[model samples]
Target: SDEKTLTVSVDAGYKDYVNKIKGDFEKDNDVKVKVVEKDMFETLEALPLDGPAGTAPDVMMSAFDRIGSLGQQGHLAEVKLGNKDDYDEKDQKQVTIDDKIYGAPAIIETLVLYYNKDLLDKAPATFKDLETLSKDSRFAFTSEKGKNTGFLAKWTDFYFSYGLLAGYGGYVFGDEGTNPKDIGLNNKGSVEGITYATKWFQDVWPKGMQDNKSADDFIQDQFVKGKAAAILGGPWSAANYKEAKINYGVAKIPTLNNGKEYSPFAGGKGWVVSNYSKNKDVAQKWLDYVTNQKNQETLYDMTNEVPANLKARDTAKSKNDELTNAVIEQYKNAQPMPNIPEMSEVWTGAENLKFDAASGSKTPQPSADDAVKVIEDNVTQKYTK
Candidate 1:
């Protein structure tokens, strides 16, 4: 009998984690599972060429946003997920485009409030508290012209700015981000969000924040040096804080002045079977086994990201890790990142939205109108769906 081999693509960072658990799958299926080490982005970028060239792996890891366009192009398989109900509904939607499921969700990622316990007793509970912190003279960083480095966030970046946009009652696309025809970036509520964000950029923080290019690195240094008390970021940020020996705490992001919780883009990676897979059946089986509660426990234990499996997420919560619990909690309010291909236009066109308004080059309304027009024009001309 010829032995069957199932090829799976995974990033080098996660290669060991995959190796640790493949034995269980191999034992049950009578197959040799070959782990193909490749960066997630590299695999996705090379997939279209590789698929037709007959060199694509049977399955690969994909971020929530990457799956949709690939799934639409028929590079990703339309999976009949076995544990269809295991993941959160928002996560399920991320892998589904135009009613076809592409993959199994494995992780949950969103912004959280990471604060220095040495600087504050607990996480700031509201936007009002953040405003109070910004006004405190204790955090003035005279090192760089003495800007108030109190409550810090990379607002010049749209990913961080979307929280205010959505929480203040604006969103990227209408109909839960599925209907591409309706864009609400310049709606009155969206302008309100932009106005509020602009106030934070100009009135609350240093003028240096208007520079989108190098500002995040500068802001990160402020937190690392203990000049900033609190910051908003994902798990990636927490790792750096730990490396620097900062005594920190993680909690749900603060509420806005409009009385709504900040809802940053909730996104993560998943197991996606390729349409070019020779062993599609075996690859689909791997998806179910790897994302199950037990395996998800190991995934979180190694990755430090919240599991997408509802039960496994709660199981992770049982541990003493505040970052895990905070992510899971805030994710309850997170808006799904738009999965359609038009979303790329949103990123490119809206890149300068925060900078323009914050720098007073344009009012919030004009800034929103201009960015939305750019996105709308690009979507109309480039996308044919």
Candidate 2:
């Protein structure tokens, strides 16, 4: 018990991955690194309480978005990277909140469109092109009852919905993606944005095609078997497509009908030191070591996480991979998902609005208006106190 020990909380899924390098750090520093396995979200939720009580880990794996809330609550320790330039500038920005860096960027991921190369010579440039392609019987671009689908996405999910919503300038908060005081979901552009998304759900595709209830298997099955032409998916789907032996390509989601780009939310996960840690120095050293370039490359080799370290990213096998390149292209224009605490309120509100709009229980504009009001009210009620 007298020996120096650093307790770290990592997503249970990453236990083996971390352990692969855990011994190296332990040997080099002459300290035991104890890992507590927990889901990132669960860890973030419990940290503010656990940390003050001296029961929290010295460091934790967490998504960048949670930094805003954790930093606001004084539960995160500022992380200093010796080689700040080694990380992707965007990813570095992701871990920074209130002008302070709270974490070391680990993995970067965002949604991109995946298409069967054999079905379409090239990906469509806009939703209008998608509509034109849908009419063709040769491709599964739209759903006909008891038939295949072309583009099936979980439209009700807020992560997916943000792509379409933000295309029309709708946002959960301020332009910088941090200010909780400004909620933009109900404005003119957002109304237009949601209204635009309604066309695809209610008119463009058959109800069965874009069911929110189905599993990832159903969506990927259609695309992999040539029953669907393209899909809105993330990097996680690339291995499956490769394994399926289908010739596929990745591209940005097409522009909306009004010429606005479908800017999906860009976000990532990282490692953060807890403010309450007695071993801040050792915790930060371990974090820095784990997220360093070589380790990032190793992490990608093992996990396919798409490393956020710039040099590691360029050196990783995924750099030249079609799906990874496409993700990089998509991220160029992707909107950063807000990291503020109020964002917690926006997700459910937006989901309800999208669900209702898709089900015909509510139209887009009014649904957006209602969602924004609820989000604003909830955020206001919580923060004003």
Candidate 3:
């Protein structure tokens, strides 16, 4: 009766391990942790109402993308993460908003190169390797374009396109993506990545790749049917590839034409403390305790998602899952999807960025220029002057 209860809302899927760990925290410390089993979306829907009513959980799991807006809305607290150094820069980048820390990262994910081993004896190490392979007659599905077979990527999709943009030193915002007004998506570095992508559309890849609507499924089918030797995808792709029975290999994506790491958007779940909660310090302790290397292994053992803790990642490596290991390695260069509210505008504004340039309707520069203007206008009207 004298003890305090620190209520933590966990996704229903994670309830088992969370409660299991809750016991140890309660035993080690004097406080009792109440693990509230709720779906992630449900928890999110309840936060605004519950926080004011004094019924909000002390901490909750949120997708990395949701943390920034929540932080800006004053729903989440900015705190000094107990073990900030334990997370890699990419992991740290995800929970950061406007140079402030809002959460501790738990699970991790990003894009990687998935290659069909039967068609290619060795993994392609660079963009040039893919280019050379494109000239192989067997891969020449189109006479002039050298398109349709050797390698494929869904560059038309912004989620998949940002990595190329970032590798060329382009970024969503000027200051580590916190400065909404300083959008750099159409800057010189980004245009350079766009130019490179244009070459693939014009000379190396198929016409369908330039189509926004069907390109995703087309690329998936190409890789699934073994027509594609390699492709870029996330960890979730492993299940489908396994189902298709493809002999494939996973690795960090090949270096860009400029010899930079192909930095895809880093994404996954993290734990954020509620600003309305009375137990801020205890909330952080819970975050640190659950994300420690040993407990992260328990998380991985239960959910199979990659852990954000660097040391725990090594423990994941021994699981003999190549997809898991490749995610860990490639994550080193991945860009945290900008967590600011302005990011939504960028996504909407840049919807046709790659397609317009790649389809030969406009050059890369103008397409990028136009996209940036659209994003800037929306940000000015809604977020900033």
Candidate 4:
């Protein structure tokens, strides 16, 4: 039964996907999957050392943000995707590096607004609604702040609500695909985006939402504890609401004051074969089997996560009736996060921009400037040749 044994490195949190699918994969091929879980930082740090030393897994699940850097370094083996046409358009750019595919799509997730139905029968349609409620001391919202904030200010979902600022052109980067050189952070649109997002955060959260909270906390925790009515989160938190027996609902993040809706940087995770793996063929085979629609279905059922496999998402369970529709609606407007190497640098710089905006000192103009500066300084000039 030793068709082959492929070692896999994964985020420890996704236990359901690994446990349910490992046996199915083994049944289909002589492949025995070995899963090793590690913290996100540790896994990212180990990639270069593991790949070159032949100590890495045949394949590892990772985020789109690092694709550029990894590809430039020749750290990923090209993924021979079978049906490019059938794949979700949101993810096409994420796994594509210089027109070559380097990874298989696994899960697609994005930040959305979750409201406590018991607390408020009607979910807020805009930030102003949230503000009015919070000002009355009836509700609160929490955001991860400072050095600990991870993925909190992904304002791409609600960019059009605030009035267009002077430089805000309704575009982030001018035609990001055709004109990669043009930066959008300092533009009027970016300022508007930052201002709107900051206002939303300040209105709902202020300085006191929770004594100790994780960025991953669902609004369900805040609501069940009677602290808040709504919060932003990803589809991955759907299960937490069910477990807490909280009556909750989900909605696509709201639009800005002008009715221009946002396109979220649809975040995804997947498997990449180590460039230095001795078992390159084995890695590809394993990824091919697992990323297929059939396997994607199994993982979706187990985790309630939106599947990167477009076909499998149709049946993936969203524990709450209200949330299921919201997740699907959000999926329709998703924008794939940038996969370029400098994307990492952009994210790091965004931390400062987000913090400043949240503090109310950095208006949207400066917020966008800070983000653009990060790209200008750290994201310029580098291609994995």
Candidate 5:
């Protein structure tokens, strides 16, 4: 059989790590292992076109969300992990689409609060407490009405704002986020959340902050330089903070008003096999090797990200890093982003809805209704079931 080579597509950033382990797979299997470096988005966009041309990768890196779209398009093969129980059940659920596992999840990421030690001795326990601390000029919380803030976040972005909206009982879909038939964006709780988000825009945030590049830069720089107190960001920022030599602390996002728990969206990136793969068996062997517990540990060491493998996660915990610990704590309440193809249309509409409500151009209820209509229309048209 001339089909002795396995081609894998991975993010360019992971080239070195993949190359380091490629030899082992090649040696053990008596086959050549070729690695193609491409961005994850590029791989997703090209796979459907490339597969029919026989130019598609045998294994490709992808986010869990892509599984639904790709799986529906008949581009993804059913994944069978060698040691499935080693992975977190939560992450396993993320890669499952329509009752079949489609990928081996490698990493888990969610947002947390990063606080500058010099400005605030301890992180606030709740949003109400944060507002109380905002009154102190040294804290530098991002607020409105031509003012500055210490805790600056991209409030207009649905990725960041969904935490509050969901905490207040707003949801994008029904059937535990699987069914597209029911949308809860315009419910009483969502309206309340949107109305609450608008108050921050009207009172504490600076006028034109969304459009002001200089202001945005100033806020971000202030946090990095230890001038600002805190910010809502993801784990990728940890390295920058370490390099800046800033004494920062990481903690779970605080509770919202009414003691409602804020729940950020949890997402994962993983490796999926192509349904049109010429060498499915060998590709799966490579996938198992790359995502094994030992390799997951190695990946965590190389990338400084949390692994989806529970055993590797426990190993990472032994290092006693506060940032990692805070991430674990935050994961307690984080909701997995829905891995449905219909979710593709919700982000843009949600952004417009939240932004309009926050800017006072449209009230919460009407904006929520409009967003729901847009989302439902798209979902119904895309999926006739």
Candidate 6:
């Protein structure tokens, strides 16, 4: 029913999905939809500066991690849904920020252990099992570099999974969610987590692959191509494995007997309205249209994404069994990656810490503490600036 077209921006990789929705959208209304595609990282960095008058897209499609900073900066539009109350609890929690639903999760994503079933009778039940398997000289694993979003980008997830606490139980920050003031990057738990992560990485990955490669590339090569025993990856990788013609299976990341279950940072991307958008109402109409049942079906199916709407899975029935199961598993224990603007400072340093520790360049505690300092310094500096 809209009178004019609305333009949205998203990653170049998702063109088919966006176009599918656009075609369906034009069928029901006078509005014409336009899609502008760019690399994912470039699109995110460009959005905050692109004001309503110039460059910003009507709706921004990106990872949930971007939501924290984007929402914090007043870049995301508050989404109002017809059946907001009916959304799954995990999805609701992920999208909710400062009492406002700022973004809609297009799909659910998390790290899972991928293994060759024939090579091993059963999947490892804990991080220790992974280590034991790797040491036998018969088993091998590799992760894509820290720069790649698929595998190593969220290095924090691997560190937390092992239950290898530095001082005691693992802790990343002194006051992560609750306090804006306190810094816990150097705390005992955080150090323990980093230290263990470092050791594990060094022990498992094949030599020469460490310097410039990504964990995704590593997993693809090792698990899918090399037919290695296992890999810790997202469900999307399941499809890739299938396409590669590898025999593989997935399992929830195991937890230590003394430690809670392994939960990776949330990996889903959502749609956000641009504050600089010249057409907020137009964008909302687009948002509402996209979130609706019919459009949601087209979008999810086209992209193989779990729709942000609670009703998506039912609508996505024809999508595929493996993808469906992957969506179900991720949504079961989703943890939205921190969306705060300061999070930008956390990545490079954390990767350095993990990389160095694993490479055996520094002792575990010092490496972890160094990472904590970098995160705290970067976050605080950005906050003050």
- Best TM-score among the predictions, by candidate number: 1
lDDT of 1 by residue, 9-77 (tens): 899888988999999999999999998898799898999999999899998899988888899888999
Off by over 4 Å in 3: 30-32, 137-146, 278-281, 318-320
Compose the digit string of candidate 4's lDDT tens values, residues 1-385: 4366788777767655777778866776677788887775577678788777768777777777666567667888887765454477667777876777778887777657777777777777865565565555343223433211111232322221212221234333344432345655566566665676566556444353221133334334445565666666667677777787877778876554666544555676777787877788878778777777788877766666667776666666444445655666666766665565444455555555555676676676776686677767664655332
Evaluate all candidate structures by whole-model CA lDDT and list the values in order: 0.87, 0.78, 0.85, 0.62, 0.80, 0.61
Model 6 Cα lDDT, one tens digit per residue, 114-165: 7777677886776667656656544423342321111221243433342234
lDDT string, candidate 2, 1-385, tens digits: 5769998788877888888888899988989989778888888888879988999989888877777568777999988975577865777778777788888888777898898889888987777877777666675443354233656666767788787777877777785777776777777777777776676677656565346667355777778888778788988778888898999998878778878777788877888889999999998898789888888888977776777777887776445776767676777777667776667888778877787777788877788778777887888788753
Give the clash count for each candidate: 2, 1, 0, 11, 10, 15
Report RMSD (Å) for each prediction in the order shown.
1.4, 3.3, 2.5, 5.8, 2.7, 5.4
Cand. 3 TM to true fold: 0.90
Q: In model 1, which regions exceed 4 Å deviation? A: 143-146
Q: Model 3, range 19-105, lDDT digits (tens) per residue?
A: 878888887768899888888978887889999999999988999999888888889999666667787777787888778888899
**Each prediction's TM-score versus the true structure:** 0.97, 0.85, 0.90, 0.77, 0.90, 0.77
Candidate 2 segments exceeding 4 Å error: 1-3, 27-30, 35-38, 45-55, 139-148, 209-211, 214-221, 239-248, 257-260, 317-319
Q: Give the Å error, residue 259, model 3.
A: 1.6
Give the distance in Å from residue 320's predicted Cα in candidate 1 to where it truly belongs. Answer: 2.3
Q: What lDDT tens digits, residue by residue, belong to model 5 across residues 1-385?
A: 6649999888977888888888888888988989889888988898889999999999988877787668778998988877687976677777887788888888887888889887787987899877776566765444533355766766777888888888899887787678878887889988888998887777676655454335446556878877667778888778888898988998889899978778888876888999999899998898888888888888877877777788888887787776777677787678878888778889878877887787789988998898888888878888778
The candidate, 5 or 6, that scores higher on lDDT is 5
Candidate 6 CA-lDDT value = 0.61
Higher lDDT: candidate 3 or 4? 3
Question: Among all windows of ten consecutive residues in candidate 1, which has the lowest summed lDDT?
Answer: 140-149
Task: Tell how far residue 194 is off in model 5, in angstroms.
Answer: 1.6
